[PDB]
Design a protein around this ligand. Sequence first.
Ligand SMILES: Nc1ncnc2c1ncn2[C@@H]1O[C@H](COP(=O)(O)OP(=O)(O)O)[C@@H](O)[C@H]1O
Ligand SMILES: Nc1ncnc2c1ncn2[C@@H]1O[C@H](COP(=O)(O)OP(=O)(O)O)[C@@H](O)[C@H]1O
Ligand SMILES: Nc1ncnc2c1ncn2[C@@H]1O[C@H](COP(=O)(O)OP(=O)(O)O)[C@@H](O)[C@H]1O
Ligand SMILES: CCCCCCCCOC1O[C@H](CO)[C@@H](O)[C@H](O)[C@H]1O
Ligand SMILES: CCCCCCCCOC1O[C@H](CO)[C@@H](O)[C@H](O)[C@H]1O
Ligand SMILES: CCCCCCCCOC1O[C@H](CO)[C@@H](O)[C@H](O)[C@H]1O
Ligand SMILES: CCCCCCCCOC1O[C@H](CO)[C@@H](O)[C@H](O)[C@H]1O
Ligand SMILES: CCCCCCCCOC1O[C@H](CO)[C@@H](O)[C@H](O)[C@H]1O
Ligand SMILES: CCCCCCCCO[C@@H]1O[C@H](CO)[C@@H](O)[C@H](O)[C@H]1O
Ligand SMILES: CCCCCCCCO[C@@H]1O[C@H](CO)[C@@H](O)[C@H](O)[C@H]1O
Ligand SMILES: CCCCCCCCO[C@@H]1O[C@H](CO)[C@@H](O)[C@H](O)[C@H]1O
Ligand SMILES: CCCCCCCCO[C@@H]1O[C@H](CO)[C@@H](O)[C@H](O)[C@H]1O
Ligand SMILES: CCCCCCCCO[C@@H]1O[C@H](CO)[C@@H](O)[C@H](O)[C@H]1O
Ligand SMILES: CCCCCCCCO[C@@H]1O[C@H](CO)[C@@H](O)[C@H](O)[C@H]1O
Ligand SMILES: CCCCCCCCO[C@@H]1O[C@H](CO)[C@@H](O)[C@H](O)[C@H]1O
Ligand SMILES: CCCCCCCCO[C@@H]1O[C@H](CO)[C@@H](O)[C@H](O)[C@H]1O
Ligand SMILES: CCCCCCCCO[C@@H]1O[C@H](CO)[C@@H](O)[C@H](O)[C@H]1O
Ligand SMILES: CCCCCCCCO[C@@H]1O[C@H](CO)[C@@H](O)[C@H](O)[C@H]1O
Ligand SMILES: CCCCCCCCO[C@@H]1O[C@H](CO)[C@@H](O)[C@H](O)[C@H]1O
Ligand SMILES: CCCCCCCCO[C@@H]1O[C@H](CO)[C@@H](O)[C@H](O)[C@H]1O
Ligand SMILES: CCCCCCCCO[C@H]1O[C@H](CO)[C@@H](O)[C@H](O)[C@H]1O
Ligand SMILES: CCCCCCCCO[C@H]1O[C@H](CO)[C@@H](O)[C@H](O)[C@H]1O
Ligand SMILES: CCCCCCCCO[C@H]1O[C@H](CO)[C@@H](O)[C@H](O)[C@H]1O
Lengths: 113, 113, 113, 404, 404, 404
Amino acid sequence: SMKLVTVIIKPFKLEDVREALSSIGIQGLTVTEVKGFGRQKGHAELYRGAEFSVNFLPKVKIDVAIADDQLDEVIDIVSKAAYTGKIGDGKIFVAELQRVIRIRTGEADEAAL
Amino acid sequence: SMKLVTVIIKPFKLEDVREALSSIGIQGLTVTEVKGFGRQKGHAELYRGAEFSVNFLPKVKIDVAIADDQLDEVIDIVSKAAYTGKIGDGKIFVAELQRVIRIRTGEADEAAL
Amino acid sequence: SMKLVTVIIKPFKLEDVREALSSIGIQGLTVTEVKGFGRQKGHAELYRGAEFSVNFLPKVKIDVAIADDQLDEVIDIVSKAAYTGKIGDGKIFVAELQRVIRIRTGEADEAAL
Amino acid sequence: AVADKADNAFMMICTALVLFMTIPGIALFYGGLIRGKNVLSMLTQVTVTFALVCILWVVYGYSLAFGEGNNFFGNINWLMLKNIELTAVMGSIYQYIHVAFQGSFACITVGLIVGALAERIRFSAVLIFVVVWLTLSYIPIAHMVWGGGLLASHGALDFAGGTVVHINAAIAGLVGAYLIGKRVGFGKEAFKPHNLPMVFTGTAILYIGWFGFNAGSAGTANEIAALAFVNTVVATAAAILGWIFGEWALRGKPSLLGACSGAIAGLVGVTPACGYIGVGGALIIGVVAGLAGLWGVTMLKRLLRVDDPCDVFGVHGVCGIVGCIMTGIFAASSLGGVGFAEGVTMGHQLLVQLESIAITIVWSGVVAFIGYKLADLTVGLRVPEEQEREGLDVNSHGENAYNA
Amino acid sequence: AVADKADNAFMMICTALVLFMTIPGIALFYGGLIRGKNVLSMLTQVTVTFALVCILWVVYGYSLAFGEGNNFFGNINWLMLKNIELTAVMGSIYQYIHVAFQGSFACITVGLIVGALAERIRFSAVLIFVVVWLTLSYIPIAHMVWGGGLLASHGALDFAGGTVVHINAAIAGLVGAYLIGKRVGFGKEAFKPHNLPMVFTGTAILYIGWFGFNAGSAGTANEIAALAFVNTVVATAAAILGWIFGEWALRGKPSLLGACSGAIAGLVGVTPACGYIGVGGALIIGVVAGLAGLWGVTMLKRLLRVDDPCDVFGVHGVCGIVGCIMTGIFAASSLGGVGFAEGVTMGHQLLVQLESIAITIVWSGVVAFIGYKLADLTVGLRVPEEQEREGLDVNSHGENAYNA
Amino acid sequence: AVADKADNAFMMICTALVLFMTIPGIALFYGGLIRGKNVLSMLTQVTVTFALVCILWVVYGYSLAFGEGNNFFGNINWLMLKNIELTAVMGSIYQYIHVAFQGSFACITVGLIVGALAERIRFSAVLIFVVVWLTLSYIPIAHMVWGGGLLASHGALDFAGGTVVHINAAIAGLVGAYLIGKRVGFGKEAFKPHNLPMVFTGTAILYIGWFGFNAGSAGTANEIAALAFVNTVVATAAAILGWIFGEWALRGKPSLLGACSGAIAGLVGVTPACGYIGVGGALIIGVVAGLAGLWGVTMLKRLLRVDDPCDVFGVHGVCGIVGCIMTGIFAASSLGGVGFAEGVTMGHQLLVQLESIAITIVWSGVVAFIGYKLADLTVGLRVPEEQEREGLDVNSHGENAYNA
Ligand SMILES: Nc1ncnc2c1ncn2[C@@H]1O[C@H](COP(=O)(O)OP(=O)(O)O)[C@@H](O)[C@H]1O
Ligand SMILES: Nc1ncnc2c1ncn2[C@@H]1O[C@H](COP(=O)(O)OP(=O)(O)O)[C@@H](O)[C@H]1O
Ligand SMILES: Nc1ncnc2c1ncn2[C@@H]1O[C@H](COP(=O)(O)OP(=O)(O)O)[C@@H](O)[C@H]1O
Ligand SMILES: CCCCCCCCOC1O[C@H](CO)[C@@H](O)[C@H](O)[C@H]1O
Ligand SMILES: CCCCCCCCOC1O[C@H](CO)[C@@H](O)[C@H](O)[C@H]1O
Ligand SMILES: CCCCCCCCOC1O[C@H](CO)[C@@H](O)[C@H](O)[C@H]1O
Ligand SMILES: CCCCCCCCOC1O[C@H](CO)[C@@H](O)[C@H](O)[C@H]1O
Ligand SMILES: CCCCCCCCOC1O[C@H](CO)[C@@H](O)[C@H](O)[C@H]1O
Ligand SMILES: CCCCCCCCO[C@@H]1O[C@H](CO)[C@@H](O)[C@H](O)[C@H]1O
Ligand SMILES: CCCCCCCCO[C@@H]1O[C@H](CO)[C@@H](O)[C@H](O)[C@H]1O
Ligand SMILES: CCCCCCCCO[C@@H]1O[C@H](CO)[C@@H](O)[C@H](O)[C@H]1O
Ligand SMILES: CCCCCCCCO[C@@H]1O[C@H](CO)[C@@H](O)[C@H](O)[C@H]1O
Ligand SMILES: CCCCCCCCO[C@@H]1O[C@H](CO)[C@@H](O)[C@H](O)[C@H]1O
Ligand SMILES: CCCCCCCCO[C@@H]1O[C@H](CO)[C@@H](O)[C@H](O)[C@H]1O
Ligand SMILES: CCCCCCCCO[C@@H]1O[C@H](CO)[C@@H](O)[C@H](O)[C@H]1O
Ligand SMILES: CCCCCCCCO[C@@H]1O[C@H](CO)[C@@H](O)[C@H](O)[C@H]1O
Ligand SMILES: CCCCCCCCO[C@@H]1O[C@H](CO)[C@@H](O)[C@H](O)[C@H]1O
Ligand SMILES: CCCCCCCCO[C@@H]1O[C@H](CO)[C@@H](O)[C@H](O)[C@H]1O
Ligand SMILES: CCCCCCCCO[C@@H]1O[C@H](CO)[C@@H](O)[C@H](O)[C@H]1O
Ligand SMILES: CCCCCCCCO[C@@H]1O[C@H](CO)[C@@H](O)[C@H](O)[C@H]1O
Ligand SMILES: CCCCCCCCO[C@H]1O[C@H](CO)[C@@H](O)[C@H](O)[C@H]1O
Ligand SMILES: CCCCCCCCO[C@H]1O[C@H](CO)[C@@H](O)[C@H](O)[C@H]1O
Ligand SMILES: CCCCCCCCO[C@H]1O[C@H](CO)[C@@H](O)[C@H](O)[C@H]1O
């Protein structure tokens, strides 16, 4: 009944996604710089004689632990906020968390967030 | 019965957390530089006329795959080692791993670690 | 029936692993720069009077969401492609994904990839 | 008459120092101030405009700037430096050295402009603009001030180029920034400098090269070069402290970027003044320029509602205006300066300074407008939005700056 | 008498080169050696102390250093450079150039100190300290050695400032490091240099500017400038190899930071010596200084149990002492040097050198102690622990260096 | 006869500028072009070879290069600069300055080589190679061209070192790259430059120092220094535009690395020519060298099937050959040059240039082969594959460049 929601988005959508999450009482989260490959692909790069036709795109990955009761709303609020309609907008992944602990206090689950 | 333990901590606690893990026979793990938002928030930054009142904090994320029998001890040993008592000490997350494989040998589960 | 496959590999094996995945119809994935500790350990480093005998190794972490029907083949194709036989080749982890959504279209599961 | 080898030596080294201000000083300064996905576009724009200016200068620019002609331009007698004997002397140096030294001023002036255009300008548009603006703005203003034209004939004081360089560039940049419009994300997204140590390195190089710029404007290793050198030290130091204390007092903290910006503010302010004023004048110009720059990038920027990402106008325009005006005060003998010219009062000098400033602003502004419109009509000024989001380096240049 | 324009030219360019050593050389050198969260504090400290020193130098420092007075300080006749005619000559150059050249030495000396204080000092405390220490340590030691005071009157040899610059700074830094205490995490946490290419860039700039520092200390473009120049090349190269071979032999690998540190060790060692010794002397001083520096940052550092993050003492103090002593050997005619003064033996010169070193250490140490205590009583020397953990850039300066 | 202090001044500053080209220019240039795990190996190789060359130069190199001897080497009369009076004059400067100035050429020449060896060479092998190659290739070719030997006696024109520096280094590098073989991953893996702003910074410093290199090769601050200075500006600018327009036209985009490479191509091309040709000649040499360099790193590189990671041969070898040939055209009076020597026709000069080029290529190639074989027999040229995969910085040097 705790979920980890992972969101891979265009880096410029991060603020919009954060504001949307804070608007529903979610301000705590973790962000990672990642490199993305998919339908959207990088331009070719050239360095003197060297040609590189396969290149990653920078993306941002948000990991946010939430309660199961917030999941549908999170998905909806994040989808809207991250949306541009152009290829590469990214993905939402959802997995179960067996445990979530706040190191400082030892609180668990909803109380750890 | 394999678990992935994720720990998001203050970067200066990394060595302490590593030593605590090695002390119980856990030396293998993976570390990622991440940016954290939560109760603990970044100072304002100013660049000429530009003011930024919302800023991330650098954090370290440890991912360590373990056996289910090590979980409670890991949680306890990591919590102690990462603890400072000040806001921002971070979180432990636990999820199930369906499979863990050592690429080199093909060993699985406990034998892959 | 959706899986997240995580692969931690030597960075120079990334292209080989990508080509192997594309060869079975998997071109979409996310890559993170990570630091690894395990059986393979970093050389000592010295900076004037300061000696550092414990050092991480750079690794690449691939996260790829797939259908359950692709799992065994992915594992096999990735293991071959990432293999060097020397210590430090890395690990495959597999976890369940409860949901996978394409933000742009709202497609789910196999249709989100 | 005869070249003094001491002056030849000094002036060749001063030229290298001014060239250093562009390559790499201004490139790193602006490069660090913008985002990582756009750094190479700044470096490439500076490098390729530099090359273009160098060529246009030797083909016709030097002739039209420094040749005798009318109040507004020179002549075409020195096309490709034809008709200049290798042993020809200008002042106390070989004329060829004068060509290089003045060419280096053209280069830094143009490099300064591109900071206003950063992150959304089309590369080919910059090159077209530069050709128009160098030819019709830099060359005539240089002629008017330093090549014996209109402003010189009125006794304007501008030792090293408050008008010719700083105001001239700042206005071209400002007009550019208005015409191309605000970056996508402007009011909502965060544009932090991607690399402040890079900005500091650029600042440092600009500062060191500026001794060539200011002291070399004496044309000889004499006491006026020495005066200008010391005034450059003092004015820069005073502006750093002016800015820092303003910032610390009004915003709560002294900052690296503040200290760098103060340095530049002082260097700009003392540029017109350095060879006419005393050290107490340099100190005062410095403090004032530092505080004027701070106002320029904070309150004035908000007033203008323009996106000038590197604050070219707020520093170079504001501080160039301050410096040009203060030069007409601090040149006075009674204030430790070298003295007004025969028959000139402080009031009369201030009027001449204000007139020179006004003419520079309108002239550069009108010419810049024409250049940018030509670029817009031929190639288009602004890149498409999605190229801007991805960054100009990959889209305009096919390269990423930092590869792991 | 009359200024030689060749000397004016040389000395203005030498001054720019010394200024380059601080802005940006020493800033990047120390900046790269510390952690990323603290880089901007180092850059800001160097930049703002630089500005402060420049101002204090022209207000009173130059007068009190170089004016005629007693054994310990000069006078206040040249306050704000009043009473110095623009055409006044000092040696064979305009005095204004002498003011700038000696002011640049004050700047680098102060920049050197801050490497000892890195990562836990309060910014305002640095500024207060600098005012005290520049005024009461740098100025009197400069006067004693180069302004005709006590040590000069005893015939001390110090061509470019083994005492005035390197030992003076190193002791101020060391006392600072003892007083503020060890960084949090000191014995348990890893402090690796955050950017070694940045350290290398700083090293390179320090090296290039050092030609201005060493050769300009001749005051003229003569044969002694030439001697000093060549001795600088040789001593630096010898120290790089000395350090590298020591490191390679004793620790198993030749390192980038070792090669950079060796360069600095040689430059420091040859500073007092460069215009008095022959090239074989420079080679020997170099090798010795390189190995002495290596000892200084390894075995001596462990002995002292002090946290001097940039090893200011281990390089500048140790190598400055070595150089000052070796100058009293290698100045001998029989060893290829320029010769001892009339009536002076090697033994007598060595005693004078040791006396000069001793006086510098005590004088700087006592004054530094007073400055740091004043700072501690007014603003507090050391930042709170949590500011130190987060890093000084965000806390003292409101900026992050690298923004993605 | 008597030293001119203006020339002494100019030539000491020119020497500092050439030293700047190596420390840090070429180190950063090549350092940015390679991968992050190998950057420190490039910086350390440049720094430690620099130190070694400086020492070998003063011990015997200068004597054997510039002493009177035979067609191929000088003598050992100036070992450790013994027998050179401090007041000895060479041309119009103190001989000690000549020693330093020519020593700085030795340094940059050797620094240039290491870009060909990057990422898989053993550090100790580089040092052994350098000792052999400096002694038996650089010294005799310098003697042959500039020390009154064989090529000078035939009236070769090479003002600042198209043969002695650029071709000499490029061939040593190319032979090195063939002998050690291709990096692991060569045809399959991506080698992008790790830091293009670092490459740009190195380019800029190389450019600025090159004024010392080219203008100082006049030996005096006279009209030929002035000519060389202006030709350096023009040729560099022309090559940047040549390369950029070639790249833009043929590949679709103007690039930062293209603009930097064009700059270097022009500087190389104009090196032999700069003090013999007119400005129109410099423009043409520039455009040609720019396009020749572009060909050199694209089509020629593919033809040669060699792994020269920094394209030392494609730029320095190709453009040095172009420049050496074009010097024999553009020296003509009728083409604005200074004129052929008495009794010399264009056809005869071209033959002399081609002969000089041929001799340099074979001489350097044979000597380089011997040095690399000695290194291979003593320490082994190439590091083991797993050290190469991990990177040379950790394995050869015990350091990581960037620590978070
Ligand atoms: N199967 C996958 N597993 C993990 N990450 C993926 C997968 N497919 C795509 N991604 C990530 O999503 C990003 C966008 O994918 P893309 O196919 O380009 O756009 P869209 O999601 O709009 O179809 C990629 O850059 C990559 O980081
Ligand atoms: N709901 C969440 N999901 C994922 N990461 C989180 C969440 N809440 C906090 N974090 C991470 O934990 C870190 C500490 O959170 P914070 O609320 O500041 O401290 P504490 O855990 O001590 O209450 C954050 O910087 C962030 O990286
Ligand atoms: N228990 C673990 N949990 C998470 N990551 C691990 C674990 N053990 C190893 N790793 C990762 O796998 C990498 C390789 O481990 P190592 O033991 O060196 O090689 P091998 O997998 O070939 O035995 C490490 O660098 C680390 O990133
Ligand atoms: C500022 C650039 C615009 C002018 C370009 C045309 C220059 C030719 O204008 C001219 O040059 C001299 C002007 O005093 C005179 O010799 C002649 O009037 C005329 O030939
Ligand atoms: C080479 C052409 C130079 C002269 C261009 C004159 C045309 C002016 O261009 C214009 O000016 C305005 C800018 O305020 C725009 O808003 C108008 O839409 C546009 O007509
Ligand atoms: C080192 C700084 C401390 C001294 C500050 C006070 C300086 C004023 O001290 C003085 O200057 C000269 C000293 O020889 C003399 O003219 C007089 O004795 C005195 O007026
Ligand atoms: C290029 C380096 C190889 C030569 C090293 C040996 C140098 C000694 O060779 C010599 O020097 C002079 C040559 O003209 C002459 O004085 C003598 O022939 C001989 O003593
Ligand atoms: C100090 C020794 C220098 C002379 C070395 C001569 C030996 C040549 O070495 C060789 O040359 C070939 C390179 O094409 C290799 O392929 C051969 O295997 C090897 O015998
Ligand atoms: C030293 C330079 C001082 C210049 C002060 C200019 C004041 C600008 O003021 C303004 O300009 C804006 C356009 O940018 C307009 O939109 C505003 O209506 C107008 O108030
Ligand atoms: C922009 C307005 C500037 C006003 C000038 C104020 C400076 C003081 O005013 C003046 O300065 C000199 C006294 O030192 C006198 O020579 C002048 O006659 C007097 O006008
Ligand atoms: C030579 C100096 C030229 C000054 C040009 C001033 C152009 C003002 O332009 C105005 O700018 C405002 C701020 O963005 C906009 O809101 C207005 O729509 C626009 O017309
Ligand atoms: C010195 C001036 C430099 C001129 C740069 C040439 C820029 C050519 O750039 C081009 O212009 C066309 C017009 O939109 C486009 O259609 C082409 O795609 C594009 O290559
Ligand atoms: C060239 C300079 C040589 C100086 C050698 C000094 C030897 C220091 O030695 C020591 O200093 C420590 C304080 O730091 C004390 O705690 C130790 O008790 C004492 O042994
Ligand atoms: C710190 C101790 C240094 C001791 C000095 C050793 C140097 C050799 O000793 C000496 O050198 C010269 C011979 O070249 C002579 O002029 C001196 O008389 C002699 O003392
Ligand atoms: C002018 C030179 C001043 C030298 C000051 C020496 C101060 C020694 O101070 C000592 O340092 C030790 C090492 O950290 C500590 O353990 C001791 O408690 C402390 O008293
Ligand atoms: C040239 C000397 C520079 C002086 C810098 C002024 C530093 C003022 O700094 C301050 O000092 C007070 C005392 O603790 C604090 O309470 C204030 O919060 C703080 O602003
Ligand atoms: C300016 C320099 C021009 C040199 C052109 C050389 C053409 C090289 O050509 C080739 O060299 C290869 C070795 O690298 C061989 O393997 C090929 O067989 C041969 O065609
Ligand atoms: C590599 C081949 C270069 C061929 C040289 C072409 C240059 C034109 O040819 C020439 O140039 C001069 C006219 O300006 C005359 O002095 C020469 O006699 C003539 O040969
Ligand atoms: C002085 C200039 C020396 C030129 C040396 C040319 C050596 C050519 O060497 C050849 O290189 C080819 C390309 O990698 C290889 O395929 C061949 O096996 C090899 O023999
Ligand atoms: C100026 C020339 C520098 C010489 C550098 C000395 C390099 C010594 O390097 C060595 O050489 C041996 C031979 O393989 C190895 O066995 C040793 O492990 C290694 O230390
Ligand atoms: C002589 C000075 C000329 C000043 C020209 C000011 C041009 C700025 O005018 C503008 O340009 C755009 C239309 O082209 C509008 O979109 C901007 O909002 C407006 O500021
Ligand atoms: C003239 C030289 C004066 C040397 C002053 C040495 C001051 C170092 O003395 C110290 O300072 C702190 C107390 O303030 C202690 O905490 C340190 O452990 C101790 O080293
Ligand atoms: C005088 C010029 C000498 C040129 C020497 C060319 C040496 C390159 O010859 C080679 O070296 C290796 C064998 O040692 C082979 O593996 C390479 O494939 C081959 O190119």
